[PDB]
Amino acid sequence: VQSSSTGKICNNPHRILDGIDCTLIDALLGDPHCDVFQNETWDLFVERSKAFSNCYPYDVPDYASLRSLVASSGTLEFITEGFTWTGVTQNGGSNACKRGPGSGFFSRLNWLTKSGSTYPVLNVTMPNNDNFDKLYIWGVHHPSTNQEQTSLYVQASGRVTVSTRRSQQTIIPNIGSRPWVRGLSSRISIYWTIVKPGDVLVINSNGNLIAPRGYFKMRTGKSSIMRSDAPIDTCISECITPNGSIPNDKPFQNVNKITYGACPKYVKQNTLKLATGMRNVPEK
Amino acid sequence: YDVPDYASLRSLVASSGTLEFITEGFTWTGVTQNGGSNACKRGPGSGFFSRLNWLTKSGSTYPVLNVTMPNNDNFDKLYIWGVHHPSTNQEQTSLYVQASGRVTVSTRRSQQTIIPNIGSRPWVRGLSSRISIYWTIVKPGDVLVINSNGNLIAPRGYFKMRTGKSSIMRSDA
Amino acid sequence: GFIENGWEGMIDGWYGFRHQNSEGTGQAADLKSTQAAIDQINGKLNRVIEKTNEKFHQIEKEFSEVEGRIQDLEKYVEDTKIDLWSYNAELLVALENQHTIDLTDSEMNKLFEKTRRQLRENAEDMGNGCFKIYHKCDNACIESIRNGTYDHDVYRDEALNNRFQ
Amino acid sequence: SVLTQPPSVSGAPGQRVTISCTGSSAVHWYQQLPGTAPKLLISGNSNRPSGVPDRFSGSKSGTSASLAITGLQAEDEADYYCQSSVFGGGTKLTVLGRTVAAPSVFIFPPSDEQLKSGTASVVCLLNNFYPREAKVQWKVDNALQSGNSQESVTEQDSKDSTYSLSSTLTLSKADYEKHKVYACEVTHQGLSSPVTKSFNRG
Amino acid sequence: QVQLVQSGAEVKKPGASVTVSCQVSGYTLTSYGLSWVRQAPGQGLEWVGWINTYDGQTKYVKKFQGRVTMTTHTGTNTAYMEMKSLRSDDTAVYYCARVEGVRGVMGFHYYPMDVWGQGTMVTVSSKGPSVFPLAPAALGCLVKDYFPEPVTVSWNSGALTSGVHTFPAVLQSSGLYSLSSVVTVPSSSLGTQTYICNVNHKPSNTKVDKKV
Ligand SMILES: *[C@@H]1O[C@H](CO)[C@@H](O[C@@H]2O[C@H](CO)[C@@H](O[C@@H]3O[C@H](CO[C@H]4O[C@H](CO[C@H]5O[C@H](CO)[C@@H](O)[C@H](O)[C@@H]5O[C@H]5O[C@H](CO)[C@@H](O)[C@H](O)[C@@H]5O)[C@@H](O)[C@H](O[C@H]5O[C@H](CO)[C@@H](O)[C@H](O)[C@@H]5O)[C@@H]4O)[C@@H](O)[C@H](O[C@H]4O[C@H](CO)[C@@H](O)[C@H](O)[C@@H]4O)[C@@H]3O)[C@H](O)[C@H]2NC(C)=O)[C@H](O)[C@H]1NC(C)=O
Ligand SMILES: *[C@@H]1O[C@H](CO)[C@@H](O[C@@H]2O[C@H](CO)[C@@H](O[C@@H]3O[C@H](CO[C@H]4O[C@H](CO)[C@@H](O)[C@H](O)[C@@H]4O)[C@@H](O)[C@H](O[C@H]4O[C@H](CO)[C@@H](O)[C@H](O)[C@@H]4O)[C@@H]3O)[C@H](O)[C@H]2NC(C)=O)[C@H](O)[C@H]1NC(C)=O
Ligand SMILES: *[C@@H]1O[C@H](CO)[C@@H](O[C@@H]2O[C@H](CO)[C@@H](O[C@@H]3O[C@H](CO[C@H]4O[C@H](CO)[C@@H](O)[C@H](O)[C@@H]4O)[C@@H](O)[C@H](O[C@H]4O[C@H](CO)[C@@H](O)[C@H](O)[C@@H]4O)[C@@H]3O)[C@H](O)[C@H]2NC(C)=O)[C@H](O)[C@H]1NC(C)=O
Ligand SMILES: *[C@@H]1O[C@H](CO)[C@@H](O)[C@H](O)[C@H]1NC(C)=O
Ligand SMILES: *[C@@H]1O[C@H](CO)[C@@H](O)[C@H](O)[C@H]1NC(C)=O
Ligand SMILES: *[C@@H]1O[C@H](CO)[C@@H](O)[C@H](O)[C@H]1NC(C)=O
């Protein structure tokens, strides 16, 4: 039983991506202090405990599922598509999410507001003509006051429907005050849609849409995400735990039940001695 | 009543291992508190659940209630609240001046909003109306905000959550 | 068992001979039995647990908040797997140690019996694992015994005379 | 497990300082400004954190780490520690203004009430001597004591830009009359000839 | 902005127990571990201990085992360090510093203390500064055998301000501090008149004015 760890994560042979102050979703959306993580790839994404959010207060229903599937895809390669939003103002932002010196927003999301004094029923489409899945990340804005709702969106109550040939997903945004986070009582709800190859995506919304700017190229492979404060190191090891890299010469380990790579199996016993000699009968 | 995800709530209450309830001071302005019914007879007269406060309209108005409680202690707090679904629209407007209320319970990290409906339901103990029971867990250092414009069965306090070796069993032994 | 004592002075091998005759006491190790036991031991864990399997994407095993049913199910699955693998490890180590001990005892007995069969009638087992040979057996004789080519027939008459007078 | 370090470095503004730490077993360098909380100067033996000027630097040999300070100025004057858990011994970094001068030595005998204390502490004083590397020898009838007397130096004064030392040797009453007459000797850089000032009671 | 705000200075008596607090600001307490580091006055930094917020596991020095307890109030983003069985030698400034690792590793093995608090002067002692004269030029006052360091020395409080040198205090095998304050005087003025030195010691609360 391997019961000790070196305390550091070996950066080979696995493509490690240390997320400094960035969560997976924060790096995905494009938080300013996560701008360095655009188009990154990894074999194992290491997520530090010190990661924080510094943008519009959002919320991800089924956050674990999205984190799991993004980690499994193993890439943050984002292809911007040309969406044509007619009759609305694009690239909305706020001073709670300060990109550069001025107000800003997530770099992968487009906040569409009313143009002039109207908000038409946006109805856009994108076909998936490629032979890989596309991941579209969109959102719904929940304002704090009805005055804000009508000031941003001429409709008194918008709705957002995102659909494919096989499934649909509709959200009725609500207006209400919420706990104060970074100066705001309004929220974003983050949803995702997977467009399989040869399928089409249709977005029909009459208000409160935080539209996508493109798609994330989905992949299949040996990628995952880990929560660990172990420091990265320049070294060789096939088995990674939150406690660092460990040698995989022994068949069992008692360090952690969370493992990655060609790792030993986790057992509750800290020691199991296997005799490699004969019965020992000494003199006297 | 009715508990969506009844198994999860039963599991987590059993795991907490205590029913110790700390009453908090909620300030409901402009509404009538301590609603009750004759289907739930506590003592000789009409009554209700002892851990829930049925807030109805006061006079002829129902303001948008917006109350808050911070979790300044270092343990989780469990808040049990409800939403009343009336049988008839007449009852809805007679109890709640709004034609369609809604209930939003939120913390710094999550929110949970319910749009009550009005409709007749199977007759249980003389009633076709229902209660839907929801819960919220306020982690230490967090805040709870309740914003409702009608159909709120508010909490009276919080259940002190715990961690331990507790469970629940179905047995006639 | 019937050896009753190991030889800490033996560093040449695991099993070996200590002889005493007119010339003087000598000691040597038997390489074949020691090598056989070591060869049979050298693996003994790659032959059951081939290697460490390679796991890339798994379930979450640490939770911050409290969800309910699904977190309970995940905890249960992880606990069941951990308990089963702990039992597998415990049982495997116990069985392998027991079998290794029986194997080494059998190898010692096999060496003793092979030596006894080389000395057909020329030697008598004193019972403490040590043979009393009943004829002139010089160092060439002893190394022939150790070699496995001991010719018992040419000492048969002298040995029988020493035994039965 | 143990960290070693040069104890004190005196220098003017504007030059280089090299401090060494020797870790038996990640070494980080911290600075404590006078009357302020410590600050992290480098982590990982060579990495400067945010807000630390690029003049600070760190170099790692096999076992010895070294902190080099460049463009020295006022705020650099502080105490510096190496950390690896165990701390270093500390390294005072004093500012130095260059002005050669000569010591003036006085001897102040222990006071009568100090005699009644049961402990006799004899003090000799050097005033306005420029090389702080000077040394003081306690003369008790040509007997030299190491480790028994405590010394303390005043910082530079902008009035005069020079140092003053006080050395006090403590000893029991029977040791006070052990030697008849006492003295304090000064070996100095600015003053070539060592000067011994003697004194006694009576 | 990341900030650690510590308690106020505490004055206790030997054998008691004290509780210092550290309020964090600009980040979440459970994201970072917290080390506690003491510094006796002019005796160099000394690592006291380490608390792993978010799982509550501690690590104290063998010198402090059993008589120091660290806790975290996560509701108020606060951490507490209590020292029990206070001694006289425990008078020091205590700092809470922020360390990075809390999950998978013990942070202080691999990470530095990147943010410090202002520190609290926990003084568990009291001792009077014995004053002695110094006459043979120059003349001074010798302050001896006081535990708590902060002591100011003036001369008639407005007479002598230049030519006075306050050698900073020095240690002693007894654990008490001692310094001196000497002023040059014209050789004529030493005999015509004498001056008075005022030694003020707040922790022992003693103010002694003495001549030559
Ligand atoms: C590899 O890395 C891993 C991860 O870092 C290491 O795992 C840790 O190892 C240490 C060392 O043994 C463990 O500490 C020990 O804990 C036991 C009791 O543990 C029980 O509680 C643990 C902590 O619970 C906190 O956290 C969880 C999750 O957040 C939370 O649900 C709890 O409610 C609690 O949170 C409370 O505390 C916070 C901080 O104060 C507050 O913010 C909060 O509000 C709460 O107040 C829990 O982890 C533990 O184990 C469970 O989970 C592990 C998974 O790791 C699983 O294996 C177990 O089977 C359990 O399911 C228990 O529930 C304690 O008794 C030990 O006491 C020793 O030390 C103390 C002094 O330190 C002495 O007084 C004791 O006498 C005794 O000597 C010890 O403290 C730690 O629990 C464990 N896990 C984690 C997540 O940290 C691992 O050790 C590393 N291995 C190697 C080889 O490097
Ligand atoms: C429904 O009810 C809820 C709760 O009852 C209300 O939510 C509160 O709304 C108020 C006003 O909008 C919010 O007040 C703001 O709080 C911010 C957070 O303050 C905390 O942190 C700061 C440190 O940054 C501490 O100093 C402070 O003590 C708190 O601990 C403040 O930063 C804001 O300050 C700004 O505005 C004030 C206004 O005068 C200025 O004085 C300041 O300088 C600064 O410009 C502000 O005070 C409060 O945070 C909300 N709480 C929650 C939990 O969300 C809803 O508004 C209410 N809605 C309706 C429709 O009734
Ligand atoms: C939509 O459609 C549904 C079903 O079609 C309606 O629901 C029914 O509504 C009626 C009237 O509101 C309910 O009638 C009540 O039923 C109670 C239950 O009766 C059962 O049990 C009793 C024993 O207690 C048996 O005797 C009986 O046979 C049943 O097996 C009765 O107890 C009630 O009786 C009371 O009122 C009557 C009225 O005259 C008196 O005579 C009695 O003495 C007593 O005071 C009553 O009869 C019925 O239960 C509902 N069914 C269900 C499944 O919910 C909705 O009302 C309808 N809504 C709309 C808007 O159209
Ligand atoms: C990421 O890659 C895509 C396609 O490879 C490219 O269009 C895009 O500009 C890249 N983003 C950055 C920030 O380089
Ligand atoms: C339950 O305990 C709480 C606090 O301990 C107390 O306030 C409350 O009154 C108790 N309830 C009853 C019914 O005793
Ligand atoms: C032992 O026997 C083998 C084969 O019978 C022979 O080749 C060898 O010379 C003998 N003697 C040794 C190995 O000393």
The domains of chain E are located at 3-123, 130-211
Task: Give long-range contacts, CB 8 A cutoff, 24+ apart: C96-103.
Answer: C96/A274, C96/A275, C96/C44, C96/C45, C97/A274, C97/A275, C100/A275, C100/A276, C100/C41, C100/C44, C101/A275, C101/A278, C101/A279, C103/C37, C103/C40, C103/C41
Indicate if ligand 3 lies below 6 Å from the C-beta of B126: no
- Whether the CB-CB separation of A262 and C52 falls below 8 Å is answered with yes
Indicate if ligand 3 lies below 6 Å from the C-beta of B59: no
Pairing state between β E78-83 and E18-25: antiparallel
Q: Which one-letter DSSP state was computed for residue A154?
A: S
Packing angle between helix C69-118 and helix B6-16, nearest 10 degrees?
A: 70
Is C15-164 in CATH node 3.90.20.10?
Answer: yes
Q: What is the largest CA-CA distance in chain B?
A: 53
For residues B156 and C45, give the distance between their C-alpha atoms in angstroms, rounded to a whole number. 62
Q: What is the CATH number of domain D3-95?
A: 2.60.40.10
Q: DSSP secondary structure string, D103-137?
A: -EEEEEPPPHHHHHTTEEEEEEEEEEES-TT-EEE
Between the two ends of chain E, the Cα-to-Cα distance in Å is 52
The CA angle D52-D78-E150, to the nearest 5 degrees, is: 135
Preceding omega of E136 cis (within 30 degrees of 0) = no
Q: How far is A56 from chain E (nearest CA, A)?
A: 17
Find, in chain E, the residue whose alpha carbon is nearest to that of D200. Answer: E136
Given strand A239-241, what is the order of strands in its sheet?
A244-246, A239-241, A260-262, C54-55
Quick count: other Cβ atoms within 10 Å of Cβ C106? 11
Q: Within an 8 Å CB–CB cutoff, is residue A182 touching chain B? A: no
Q: How far is CA E154 from CA A117, B93, D126, E181, E189, in A?
A: 76, 83, 21, 9, 18
The residue whose CA is least distant from atom 8 of ligand 6 is C147
The token pair at D119 is 């402990």
Q: Are C52 and A223 an interchain contact pair (Cβ–Cβ within 8 Å)?
A: no
Question: What percent of the residues of chain C are helix, what percent strand, and what percent coil, each to the nearest 5?
Answer: 50, 10, 40
Between the two ends of chain C, the Cα-to-Cα distance in Å is 32
- Whether the CB-CB separation of E81 and E36 falls below 8 Å is answered with yes
Q: Which residues pair with A19 in a beta bridge?
A: A47
The three-state secondary structure class of E49 is strand
Q: Which residue has the tokens 């609603």?
A: B35
The token pair at A34 is 């996560």
Selecting from 2.60.40.10, 2.60.34.30, 3.30.70.580, 3.40.50.2300, what CATH number does the domain D104-199 have? 2.60.40.10
Quick count: other Cβ atoms within 10 Å of Cβ E8? 8
Name the nearest CA neighbour of E172 among A235, D169, B76.
D169
- Whether the CB-CB separation of A41 and A15 falls below 8 Å is answered with yes
Name the nearest CA neighbour of E72 among E27, E15, E34, E124.
E34
Residue B154 CA neighbour count, 13 Å, CB half = 29
Q: Which one-letter DSSP state was computed for residue C93?
A: H
Task: Give me the phi and psi of B13, to 5 degrees please.
Answer: -65, -40
Ligand 4 centroid to residue A77 C-alpha, Å: 7
Q: Are E103 and A242 an interchain contact pair (Cβ–Cβ within 8 Å)?
A: yes
The residue whose CA is least distant from atom 3 of ligand 5 is B22
Pick among B12, B112, B161, B168 to test the C interface (most C CBs inside 10 A):
B12
Q: What is the CATH number of domain E130-211?
A: 2.60.40.10
CB within 8 A of A256, min separation 6: which ones? A241, A242, A243, A266, E104
CB within 8 A of A48, min separation 6: which ones? A18, A19, A20, A21, A228, A229, E100
Domain assignment of residue A28, given as a range: 15-230
Q: Within an 8 Å CB–CB cutoff, is residue E61 touching chain D? A: no
- Whether the CB-CB separation of D23 and D3 falls below 8 Å is answered with yes
Q: How far is CA A263 from CA A260, C55, C56, D188, E118, in A?
A: 6, 7, 10, 68, 45
**Please, where in chain D does CATH 2.60.40.10 lie?**
3-95, 104-199
The amino acid sitting at B71 is N
Residues after which chain D is broken (C–N above 2.5 A) are 25, 84
The token pair at C86 is 């702990």
Pick among D1, D164, D165 to test the E interface (most E CBs inside 10 A):
D164
Element of type H or E holding C161: helix C156-164
Architecture of domain E3-123: Sandwich (2.60)
Find, in chain A, the residue whose alpha carbon is nearest to that of E102. Answer: A229
* Chain E stretch 29-48, residues whose beta carbon is closer than 8 A to a beta carbon of chain A: 30-32
Pairing state between β D79-83 and D91-95: antiparallel
The residue whose CA is least distant from atom 13 of ligand 6 is C147
- Whether the CB-CB separation of B76 and B138 falls below 8 Å is answered with yes
Provide the domain count of chain A.
1
Ligand 3 centroid to residue B124 C-alpha, Å: 10
Q: What is the largest CA-CA distance in chain E?
A: 75
The token pair at B136 is 């919220």
The CA angle C113-C117-C121, to the nearest 5 degrees, is: 130
Q: Which residues pair with A189 in a beta bridge?
A: A59, A140
- Whether the CB-CB separation of B78 and B158 falls below 8 Å is answered with yes
Q: Within an 8 Å CB–CB cutoff, is residue E170 touching chain D? A: yes
Q: Which residues pair with C27 in a beta bridge?
A: C18
Name the nearest CA neighbour of A233 among A2, A16, A3.
A16
Distance from the Cα of residue E132 to its chain's centroid: 25
Q: What is the resolution of this structure in A?
A: 4.2
Q: Which residue has the tokens 């129902």?
A: B62
Q: Which one-letter DSSP state was computed for residue A206?
A: S
CB < 8 Å to B68, chain A: 179
Given strand D8-11, what is the order of strands in its sheet?
D8-11, D91-95, D79-83, D28-32, D38-42
The three-state secondary structure class of A3 is coil
Q: Is it true that E3-123 and E130-211 share their CATH fold?
A: yes
Query: Domain limits of chain C?
Result: 15-164
- Whether the CB-CB separation of D103 and D134 falls below 8 Å is answered with yes
The token pair at A282 is 């000494």
Task: Give long-range contacts, CB 8 A cutoff, 24+ apart: A67-72.
Answer: A67/A24, A67/A25, A67/A225, A68/A225, A68/C57, A68/C60, A69/A135, A70/A24, A70/A25, A70/A28, A70/A135, A70/A216, A70/A225, A71/A24, A71/A45, A71/A223, A71/A224, A71/A225, A71/C57, A72/A220, A72/A221, A72/A223, A72/A224, A72/C57
What is the experimental method? cryo-EM
By CB neighbour count within 10 A (0-12 exposed, 13-18 middle, 19+ buried), where does C132 fall? exposed
The token pair at C107 is 């190898």
Task: Give me the phi and psi of C140, to 5 degrees please.
Answer: -65, -40
For residues A244 and B50, give the distance between their C-alpha atoms in angstroms, rounded to a whole number. 52
Residue ranges of alpha helices (H) inside chain B are 6-16, 89-95
Element of type H or E holding D22: strand D17-22
Between the two ends of chain D, the Cα-to-Cα distance in Å is 54
CB within 8 A of B85, min separation 6: which ones? B116, B117, B118, B119, B121, B129, B130, B131, B132, B151
Rg (CA), chain D: 21
CA dihedral (C141, C144, C146, C152) in degrees, to 10, reads -80
The CA angle D119-D121-D126, to the nearest 5 degrees, is: 175
Q: DSSP secondary structure string, A29-83?
A: HT-GGGGGGTT-B-SEEEE-TT----SS-EE-TTHHHHHHHHHHHTB--EEE---
Q: Which one-letter DSSP state was computed for residue B127?
A: B
- Whether the CB-CB separation of C40 and C96 falls below 8 Å is answered with no
